[PDB]
Amino acid sequence: QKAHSFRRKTRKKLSKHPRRRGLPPLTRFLQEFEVGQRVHIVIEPSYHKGMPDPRFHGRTGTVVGKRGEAYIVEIKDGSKVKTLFIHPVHLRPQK
Amino acid sequence: MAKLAVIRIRGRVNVKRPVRDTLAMLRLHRVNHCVIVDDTPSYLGMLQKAKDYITWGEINAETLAKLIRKRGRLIGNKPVTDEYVKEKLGMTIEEFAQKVVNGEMSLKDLPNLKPVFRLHPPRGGFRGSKKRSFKEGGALGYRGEKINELIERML
RNA sequence: AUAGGAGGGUGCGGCCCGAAAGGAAUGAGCCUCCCCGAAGGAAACCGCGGCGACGCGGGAGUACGAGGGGAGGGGACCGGGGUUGCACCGUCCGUCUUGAAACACGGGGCAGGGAGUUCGCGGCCGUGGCGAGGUUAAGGGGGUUAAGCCCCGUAGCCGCAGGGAAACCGACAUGCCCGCAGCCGGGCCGGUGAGGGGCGGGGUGCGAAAGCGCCCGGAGUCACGGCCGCGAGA
RNA sequence: CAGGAUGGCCUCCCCGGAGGUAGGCGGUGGGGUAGAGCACUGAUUGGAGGUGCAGGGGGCGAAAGCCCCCGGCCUCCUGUCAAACUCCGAACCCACCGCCGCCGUAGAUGGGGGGAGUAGGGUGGCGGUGUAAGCCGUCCACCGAGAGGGGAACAACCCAGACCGGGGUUAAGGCCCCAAAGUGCCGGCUAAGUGUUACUCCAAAGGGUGUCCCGGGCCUUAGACAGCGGGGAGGUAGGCU
RNA sequence: CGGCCGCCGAGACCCCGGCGCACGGAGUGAUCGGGUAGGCGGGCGUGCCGGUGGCGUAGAAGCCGGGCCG
RNA sequence: CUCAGGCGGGUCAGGAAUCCGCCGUAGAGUGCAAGGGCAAAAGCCGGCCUGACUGGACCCGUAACAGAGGCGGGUCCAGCCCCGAAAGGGUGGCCUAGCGAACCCCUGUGCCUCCCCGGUGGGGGCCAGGGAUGACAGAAAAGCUACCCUGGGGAUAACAGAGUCGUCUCGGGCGAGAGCCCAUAUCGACCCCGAGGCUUGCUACCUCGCUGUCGGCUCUUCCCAUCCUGGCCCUGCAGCAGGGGCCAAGGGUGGGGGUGUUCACCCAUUAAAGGGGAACGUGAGCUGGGUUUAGACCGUCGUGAGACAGGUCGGAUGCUA
RNA sequence: CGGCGGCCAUAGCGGGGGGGCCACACCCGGUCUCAUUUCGAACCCGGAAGUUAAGCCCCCCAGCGAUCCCGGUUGUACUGCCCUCCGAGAGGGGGCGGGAAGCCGGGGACGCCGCCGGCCACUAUC
Predict the structure, then answer these.
(1) Nucleotide showing the shortest C1' distance to residue B18 CA
(2) Residue B142: how many other CB atoms lie within 10 Å
(3) Chain C bases having any atom below 7 Å from a protein CB
(4) Measured CA B66 to C1' E63 distance, in angstroms
(5) Distance between the alpha carbon (CA) of B82 and the C1' atom of F120, Å
(6) Burial class (CB in 10 A: 0-12, 13-18, 19+), A72
(7) Is A21 near strand D, with its CB below 7 A from some atom of it?
(8) Which of A91, B15, B65, B81 has the most neighbouring CB atoms within 10 Å?
């Protein structure tokens, strides 16, 4: 933009307490997320390769389906309907 | 449950838009519109943000009957009365008031009657204005059951 | 000729006249009575409270109230015009400007002149004709004093098949599921559902291959008027 | 760059069609700003006790020689505080679901089309810069394009959003006169003409036995609080000079 | 300065009728009424043409002044 | 297979590489800014291997919402390999910087196509890859105008004002310190707080269909933080004479020499030879000396035209109220 | 006893006991399949005679750490909202709606839970 391409308003947003740092439990990487399910998308910075723009943080979508290892989630970022592909690492179940 | 009377001190000007929309759901539109609201946790939360903007306080049944009679109309100037109420749905102004107490019939539901009572100005001056809270000497916010007193002066 | 100005506006007085077109003499301004009566709402005096200011009860939603109706009295102006006093309010007009009463710009005054027009093309719209077709141009014949209108002329354009650089190839007169309008049955609900939406399959191009692109279950054509762009001096 | 175009945005028309969620609450998500601190990444102020050592002074000299010592180089319980630090962290903002509220079939929610306009200002909050005024972000009632009554008048401060005429009552604000309405009431403060000014109008640190009001100390016939009547010894000139 | 009480005082707010707009067919509206840029829609007037129907020396248009309506 | 670093022991000049144990949650390392991530790893080692692959999508950034090309990455599947026991991984370098239109040309590969018709030559074209615009969503590019001209602009500089008060001027508080001794007869640092609009500067509010500059001259008003005169207090006041403080604008506060000069320097007088505001008072009152145009020379610089807070000569002051 | 997980320190440190431990370790042979740019140490083929002593399992003790709570500081610091409410134009305060860290004191906490086998067992010893 002039100071955006994947990073801006980050450092401290991707930073955690030393207790929440260390690569996280294995269970969440393995975790499957069904289609028709409502998911919170939360940025996990422990895993580089496949991580949301910070603008996306805290959005809640419905899993529209899957491509490969990742899942394809339809989310509403603002008014606009968008679909975001992300790994199971960056999804948590709603309830 | 209990029913409360809410009156809008400061109108459709000198309001922020968040507060002005909050006010709209309550069924207030101008200065000197009054409405009867039941205690419900959503409604109560609303009334609390809005407080400085409004004069609020708990209203009784007896004062409600008085209020329904004189100020009420659908058309023109026309006092509500037992015969008029009879054609309405009920048989009596009191039964209408007691159903409002139960919370089962709102003002609007009760047909050929407005959810707003268009009252007169107060009488006399004010002795701590209205730009400062009831507690400091004004009238703003929750205020006993002393809303009964104000509407009597307003007739 | 002792009193203040964007020259006035609104209300109410003075003075001034008013034949006509106005309303009214079949009753005008005007006056009086009776009643209904919105919002509103006293007084005298009394009682009881309050340091007192003053509140409270009763008087009382009464007296009173805009406005309206009816009846009555009187008998010629009233409206309206000219000008002016008083109370109240009032820093032109147009433009420029974030802000103009302006020390921003422009104006002596009045009259006359004085600025969104035409053509082509494209995109819209409304109306109207006809319909899987529609529409004729040029021309001469014709008719007429001339001419328009009337008839002939279908040259030619557009649509009825699209994709593709071209070679070149070439499709659903709707099979499945929702549901608006509407219809139907029951007592809001349950069907049937054109239009419509959602699938499937097909035609073509790229392609070892897979995967995508466009297209596909018959509506257009012409006329009139208007709206706007762009091209023109516009 | 004192200019266009394309959105956002404004209007008109048309099409499809039932919910929509600005509002508020709970549930399920995101977070390091106010604040706060020594637990890191971190910059550093200060004295101790170590004498662990690079060395500028000394010693049994063999000038820091085996061994201790002193600028000192860096541990240790401590010591200042931190946009770009954190052992931590509100109020609050926002996503989503349900509810409730409200809005909607005279068409919301959304789509396509035609026609535009495309110098800003401004009070407050939160700021960044700069002594400042000024400039620039962000949210904002509002002015711009919106009157009216009040703030003496005063684009944006207050009340208020305005079809025509009539009647009534209040609001902002005021009640000595000009000017509507109080030569108001109780009590404390005042003696400066302070003030009578929310304001755009209205000058400070310091200091006054100037006042009034609260505090605990000393101390009360064990009555010096000041006066006054009597007081101010002897050793002794303390010694030195 | 701290209490307290009675009043004054807006196109606000209230109230009666009228008027437009919106909606209702071949009365209803607490939830309608400020307005620049700009969009949308309706009417009036002006010259001449055509069609239709009238007027004029028994006094046209124009001019001047006054009345009346929207 | 797990680290800088520390601790003790060995080796060396301490030390390092190197060795042995103990401590050690990440301070190490990951090419390179910064930040974040990470310990059976992305860090370390050994072996093997060259997918930094072809093709076509998907998505986001680009350009939040919300239009917006090119370009980048991530993520899929198809194909071919690679490694691994397989699962599984690899669309280069842990992630985020290291890129480029329209057009034109050339490469690689096959076919399509070239005007009555064929053969041949030579052309044109589809796709993909590579090539610049670095002023980077992409003109083809050096200067002067005081000889200038016009449209505009107070959206914007010069004068003045307004705003502002850092700078400037002036005041108050505290009192280190010397004055033989004694802070205040006198002098007075460090620091801290106000006032004024008089210097300088900032502001871009007001004017570009003009609000003419500075200085002098003449003529006048006002202010005091007062130079003198009046009335007063102290003193390190003997007198004579100073020094310091208080009231006070009633009056006075001059003439000469240089500078265009406001200001400033100088002479002798004087009771004293005070300052500041008023369109930096006073040009519809004068003057026009200075800022200063079109003419010219010199110094400096420039290829040159030509320039100068360098010097210098000469260069209109309208109007009947 | 074992094996496979979930929450992922409430299962950290320290110390204590036992084994209801062929089977899990130590331990012993290394010829062979096989690990060492040096060593069967490591990896792997082979065995259990010996040791329960670790480990490992089970039980317990909180002094340290971490998790959570109560009270004190504190409804204080801080804040959303409004004011012709106050100040010379900054701004602040009150109401109203909320309310943190650091620290002190007083505590729970040295696991829980899911599946499957197994000497012993047919259960829970562990």
Answers:
(1) D22
(2) 19
(3) 38-41, 61
(4) 73
(5) 115
(6) middle
(7) no
(8) A91
The DSSP-derived string for B77-101 is: S----HHHHHHHTSS-HHHHHHHHH
3-state secondary structure of B4: strand
Q: Which amino acid is at A44?
A: E
- Give the residue among B49, B32, B9 at the shortest CA–CA distance from B129: B9
- Resolution in Å equals 9.0
| Separation of alpha carbons B133 and B76, rounded Å | 36
CB B29 within 7 Å, strand E: yes
Do the beta carbons of residue A57 and residue A90 sit within 8 Å?
Answer: no
Q: How far is the CA of B18 from the C1' of D156 (A)?
A: 21
Nearest to A88 by CA among A75, A77, A73: A73
Amino acid of residue A40: H
Q: Locate tokens 């507690």: which residue?
A: B135
The gap between A21 CA and F261 C1' (Å) is 80
Token output for B152:
């009597």
User: Do the strands B54-58 and B33-38 form a parallel or antiparallel pair, or are they unpaired?
Assistant: unpaired
CA R_g for chain B: 15
